[PDB]
Nucleic acid binder design. Structure first.
Ligand code: MG
Ligand code: ZN
Ligand code: ZN
Lengths: 114, 801, 62, 31
RNA sequence: GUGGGCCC
RNA sequence: GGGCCCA
């Protein structure tokens, strides 16, 4: 009975999810508003201990990740680590208008909140 | 010269006639009969207000909503000039109501400025009737997002965005604000929370107001709504609400804030539910899409690629040996397995950018569904059970996490009729959104796109299959009908169908035509009315609230669900899911909806034969002035159609024997109206270059389901024979998607399947069109060396048994 | 010889795929653009030009 | 896919265009 | 992945 | 059960 098989699988799934759910922020913001109901657009927006910016080029990474820290729509972030659309490490130094055409122009830029 | 008027003569078209020299009427008039090249006042009132420069239209594709999407700019330029007149029109309804003046309204008095004068046939006394006003200027209101004003603080264009708080959901007050701001005098109802709607007719009504009343508010507002919950102690959080941009608020009325010994089905609810997967992972953002984004599942972005065509060189030699693929020969080779890189996924997902909401111009849909009723009064549906479905094709996917473990076979076999029907019962109270996966295709073809495909979770479709699958099957085998689903061509069935579609079309000629980019430009409202229409047969097994909650649970299942493009969370403004159970039938319905629109705004902006004139006049005073579901004008029109404009259909393939007279008068269908329409109703241009018009019924159709047609002899008299394009079979035999790679067992079926396709070339004058067949014969015999081997049956397939 | 060398381009880009060009992104982008243009052939001089371009890179590697 | 390389070789040898054949000769020297 | 004809 | 064509 593969019914019970997928059942076992999905219970293990939905149980193992809680390894990063009990944040104590969740309660801190359910107890803000009435009747325990708000959208899902903003739930992992504001439980956010991470932010990944996937850009196309150099023109974007400049106007987006200016420096090694920035703000993301009125909230602050620290640039930790960057790669370049095929997962070879880059630097802010290497990322310049000079050596633009040795990039896989898009960049995955993981920054961390303060 | 010609000023376009709504006359009340009863209709709307051109008439030779401090202010503006053009009016808002002239504006919407050129909006709504776009004859490309003859598209004048459209541009005139664009350039009149610095909305776009004419020199920009020297570029190609300016009037494509599919290439050059900058016209978003050109049109959102005029948004406040729209809005201002709407508000003017409510305050004008005021200044009539308290002025005691009861006469019906029209826009020709209304300036591009917005304001008003000239009160001439008005009775002095109220209720000044707008209904023509909005029944005119309804669908063109998302065409600019004219009510972008209200999103600023103090609803002023020159301001920051209102930061609405990032937890709220309701806004019903604000929904009514925009209503009675714009619809104070709206003499018919409103239920922006549409569980309050009167019936399905009022569902279409009011959710077609949540469209306009949801352009303006932000993405933070909408989507599923989440609460903390506790089984066996520990907390979870779950979307136990949903806010549709069309259906407003909905609260799962069957909730369990506390639980214990949760169920199989309840995990079927809570497994594919969104937030469990969403808030239980990281964040993501890519500048690739114009789409809003939310999240990532895994913390690495992903890419996938194509493995290009095989090649079949034995047959290549076997052909070109006999002088195939020769110089000057129309035996060239055209069709091949393209291959595509990793940017494919996001670079067609982007083409959802061309989506935009509609205002289905409501009374017209309402009457058109008053029409389609009798296309299906010949047919019958109703709710059914797990154990009386004719399901096939069950070895297939079942949803996002449900990808990971099994096939739909398991879910039809595991979820008992008890299970699936209890689900059927819960779902007609509540709303459970789920996940869609966008994938790509390996179709040998000619052009260089990819045409993404969709797959949804089995929870959705299993309900949907229990729901509609009696009406379909009433039509899957109703032959002699309009439709042909299930109706093959074979055994000369195509022939008698052609004779049937003809059956006294008067001044008969054939026309045919096809849709560019329906699966992306699909206005969601039409999908709404279809899935409603597809349920009027439930009148012994569904109550009206259950109808509303059906409708909503499907509109969250597949239409505005959340999209996983890679490992990247988004939402979908719309666009059909090509893997849906009801794709072709819903799109058939879509096709007739377009058909009648053609009929009507043929017959509206176009009359001497008073059969015709009374038919359009009682159209006018069925729609512009009346409401009721009436069978008599209905059947007048309906048999008028079936006599004079008689049709057959497959999902976009709209074959039409029709009257040149009426078509040459402005009663019935010609391509131009459709072009205009989807340019003002489905967000696309339909170029007649891909359409065709055969003016000789003796010579069969140029196109249908990848087939042309001719006229030959059959058993002492002449008949129409369909016939395919040789290049297709050439490519598909010469290029394989790793099929003959496995064994030579199956590919016997491959080539012979391809081989029957084109025996009619044997009947056609050109020689090598024939030796297409003779090649295939000799190849088939070349294979029967190792192993119909001849043309024995391949002729008896056009001698009906 | 336009049909035949279109078939040539196809097998060429196939074997090109067989040896992991996709891993180096823009390499794959170039070759893909070349072939998607090669199958559109009307004047054969351009077809031969694009052929020799697509050949230069197979030749570049070992 | 071993025959793929061989049949493309014979394919090019049939194409019989000067530039392609000269560069095949260039390639036979690993150059 | 959808439903539809065909054939094995 | 397998697969061609078609929306
Ligand atoms: Mg067609
Ligand atoms: Zn209502
Ligand atoms: Zn029912």
């Amino acid at each position: 009975d593969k019914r019970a098989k997928v059942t076992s699988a999905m219970q293990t799934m939905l149980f193992t999810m809680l390894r990063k759910l009990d944040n104590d922020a969740l309660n801190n913001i359910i107890n803000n508003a009435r009747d325990g109901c708000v959208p899902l657009n903003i739930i992992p927006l504001t439980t956010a201990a991470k932010l990944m910016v996937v850009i196309p080029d150099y023109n974007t990474y400049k106007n987006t990740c200016d420096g090694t820290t920035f703000t993301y729509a009125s909230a602050l972030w620290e640039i930790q680590q960057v790669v370049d659309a095929d997962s070879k490490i880059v630097q802010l130094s290497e990322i310049s208008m000079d050596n633009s055409p040795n990039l896989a122009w898009p960049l995955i830029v993981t920054a961390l909140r303060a | 010269v010609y000023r376009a008027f709504d006359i009340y003569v009863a209709g709307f078209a051109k008439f030779l006639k401090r202010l503006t020299k053009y009016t808002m009427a002239d504006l919407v008039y050129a909006l709504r009969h776009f004859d490309e090249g003859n598209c004048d006042t459209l541009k005139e009132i664009l350039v009149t207000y610095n909305c776009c420069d004419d020199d920009y239209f020297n570029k190609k594709d300016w009037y494509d909503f599919v290439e050059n999407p900058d016209i978003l700019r050109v049109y959102a330029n005029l948004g406040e000039r729209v809005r201002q007149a709407l508000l003017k029109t409510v305050q004008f309804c005021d200044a009539m109501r308290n002025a005691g003046i009861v006469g019906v309204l029209t826009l020709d008095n209304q300036d591009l400025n917005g304001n008003w004068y000239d009160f001439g046939d008005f009775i002095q006394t109220g209720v000044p009737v707008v209904d023509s006003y909005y029944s005119l200027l309804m669908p063109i209101l998302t065409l600019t997002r004219a009510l972008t004003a209200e999103s600023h603080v103090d609803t002023d264009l020159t301001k920051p965005y209102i930061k609405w708080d990032l937890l709220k959901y309701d806004f019903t007050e604000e929904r009514l604000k925009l209503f009675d701001r714009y619809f104070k005098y709206w003499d018919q109802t409103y239920h922006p929370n549409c569980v309050n709607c009167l019936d399905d007719r009022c569902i279409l009504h009011c959710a077609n107001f949540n469209v306009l009343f949801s352009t303006v508010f932000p993405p933070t507002s909408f989507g599923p709504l989440v609460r903390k919950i506790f089984v066996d102690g520990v907390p979870f959080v779950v979307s136990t609400g949903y806010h549709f941009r069309e259906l407003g608020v909905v609260h799962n009325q069957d909730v369990n804030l506390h639980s214990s010994r949760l169920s199989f089905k309840e995990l079927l609810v809570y497994a594919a539910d969104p937030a469990m997967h969403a808030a239980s992972g990281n964040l993501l953002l890519d500048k690739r899409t114009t789409c809003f984004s939310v999240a990532a599942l895994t913390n690495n972005v992903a890419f996938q690629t194509v493995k290009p065509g095989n090649f079949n060189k034995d047959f290549y030699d076997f052909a070109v040996s006999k002088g195939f693929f020769k110089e000057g020969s129309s035996v060239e080779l055209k069709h091949f397995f393209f291959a595509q890189d990793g940017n494919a996924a996001i670079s067609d997902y982007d083409y959802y950018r061309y989506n935009l909401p509609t205002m289905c111009d409501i009374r017209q849909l309402l009457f058109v569904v008053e029409v389609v009723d009798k296309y299906f009064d010949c047919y019958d549906g109703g709710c059914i059970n797990a154990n009386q479905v004719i399901v096939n094709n069950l070895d297939k996917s079942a949803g996002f996490p449900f990808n990971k473990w099994g096939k739909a076979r398991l879910y039809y076999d595991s979820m008992s009729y008890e299970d699936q029907d209890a689900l059927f019962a819960y779902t007609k109270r509540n709303v459970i959104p789920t996940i869609t996966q966008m994938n790509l295709k390996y179709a040998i073809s000619a052009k260089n796109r990819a045409r993404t495909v969709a797959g949804v979770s089995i929870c959705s479709t299993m309900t949907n299959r229990q729901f509609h699958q009696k009406l379909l099957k009433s039509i899957a085998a109703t032959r002699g009908a309009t439709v042909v689903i299930g109706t093959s061509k074979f055994y000369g069935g195509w022939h008698n169908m052609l004779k049937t579609v003809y059956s006294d079309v008067e001044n008969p000629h054939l026309m045919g035509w096809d849709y560019p980019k329906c699966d992306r430009a699909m206005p969601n409202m039409l999908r709404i009315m279809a899935s409603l229409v597809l349920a009027r047969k439930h009148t012994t097994c569904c109550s009206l609230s259950h109808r509303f909650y059906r409708l909503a649970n499907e509109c969250a299942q597949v239409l505005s669900e959340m999209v996983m493009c890679g490992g990247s969370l988004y939402v979908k403004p719309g666009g059909t899911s090509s893997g849906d159970a009801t794709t072709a039938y819903a799109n058939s319905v879509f096709n007739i909806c377009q058909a009648v629109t053609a009929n009507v705004n043929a017959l509206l902006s176009t009359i001497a034969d008073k059969y015709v004139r009374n038919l359009q006049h009682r159209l006018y005073e069925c729609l512009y002035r009346n409401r009721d579901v009436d069978t008599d004008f209905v059947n007048e029109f309906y048999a008028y159609l079936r006599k004079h404009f008689s049709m057959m259909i497959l999902s976009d393939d709209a074959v039409v024997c029709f009257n040149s007279t009426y078509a040459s008068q402005g009663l019935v269908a010609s391509i131009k109206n459709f072009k205009s329409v989807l340019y003002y109703q489905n967000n696309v241009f339909m170029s007649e270059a891909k359409c065709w018009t055969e003016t000789d019924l003796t010579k069969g159709p140029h196109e249908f389901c990848s087939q042309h047609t001719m006229l030959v002899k059959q058993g002492d008299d002449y008949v129409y024979l369909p016939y395919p394009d040789p290049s297709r079979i050439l490519g598909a035999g010469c290029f394989v998607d790793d099929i003959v790679k496995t064994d030579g067992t199956l590919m016997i079926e491959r080539f012979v399947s391809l081989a029957i396709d084109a025996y009619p070339l044997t009947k056609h004058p050109n020689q090598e069109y024939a030796d297409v067949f003779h090649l295939y014969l000799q190849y088939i015999r070349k294979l029967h060396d190792e192993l119909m081997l001849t043309n024995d049956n391949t002729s008896r397939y056009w001698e009906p048994e | 010889k336009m049909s035949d060398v279109k078939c040539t381009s196809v097998v060429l880009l196939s074997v090109l795929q067989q040896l992991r060009v996709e891993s180096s992104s823009k390499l794959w982008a170039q070759c893909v653009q070349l072939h998607n243009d090669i199958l559109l052939a009307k004047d054969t001089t351009e077809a031969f030009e694009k052929m020799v371009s697509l050949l230069s890179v197979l030749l570049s590697m070992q | 896919t071993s025959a793929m390389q061989t049949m493309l070789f014979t394919m090019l040898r049939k194409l019989d265009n000067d530039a392609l054949n000269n560069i095949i000769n260039n390639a036979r020297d690993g150059c």
